[PDB]
Amino acid sequence: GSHSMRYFFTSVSRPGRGEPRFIAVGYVDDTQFVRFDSDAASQRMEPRAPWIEQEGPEYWDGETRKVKAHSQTHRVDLGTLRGYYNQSEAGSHTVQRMYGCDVGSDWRFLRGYHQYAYDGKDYIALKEDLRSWTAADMAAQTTKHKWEAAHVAEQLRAYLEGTCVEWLRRYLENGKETLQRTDAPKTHMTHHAVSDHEATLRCWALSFYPAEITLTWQRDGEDQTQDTELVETRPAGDGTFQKWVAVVVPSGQEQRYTCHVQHEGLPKPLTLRW
């Protein structure tokens, strides 16, 4: 189906001493493929997926040069924003930026993004049309005026519809053995007595990719949300994901209850029974 490339950048000022801590990460879908950490020894953009290591020294030199320039931009932004919000030099503050593109089912450009936050709140974001800006407050309005004058949206639209998509496709081919492979959830159910009249049924989904999944309970063929608990989808640590949902049921009535699993790796949804 659809695929995405996204970069995530976080800079955190350190008023006591020295420059902000800057961390950049790159993803294709739910797979991290590169990282930069200003406090790491290498001072280079580093590979985090086997399939990106195929790229030659020119790639790595270019991404390092760009990511270092990104770092310096965020450093300046922390100063700029402290001024706009009339804050002191004493406290630590955070800037975050995310950008990237999606390709659709036809493998062509679908959507582009470029958004920014200061201290965890929306600051400025490129609209879906990739032509205008959403500014949250009067500080961001100043940035909007600057960015409109400098035609930043135009530069971004060119990258998002061009280079971004092109390289996303390149990565998808080079990493196809994993990036274009779906791992269906491995599912099972457990049973636990909570009293002599009640039991918990837990429906597990393990080792799946991508992270997107739906797990639901039904009772006699109708959706059941009461007396259920559903954990947030979590990383296994080997590139796959995990999730479970549980329901409390009257002892001896377990047969009424069915767990329903929807995932890209499953041709038809799965139904589990105790």
Partner: peptide, 9 residues
């Protein structure tokens, strides 16, 4: 492939 240049706020 990172954007060639990021704009400062």
């Amino acid at each position: 492939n990172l954007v060639p240049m990021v704009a400062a706020v």
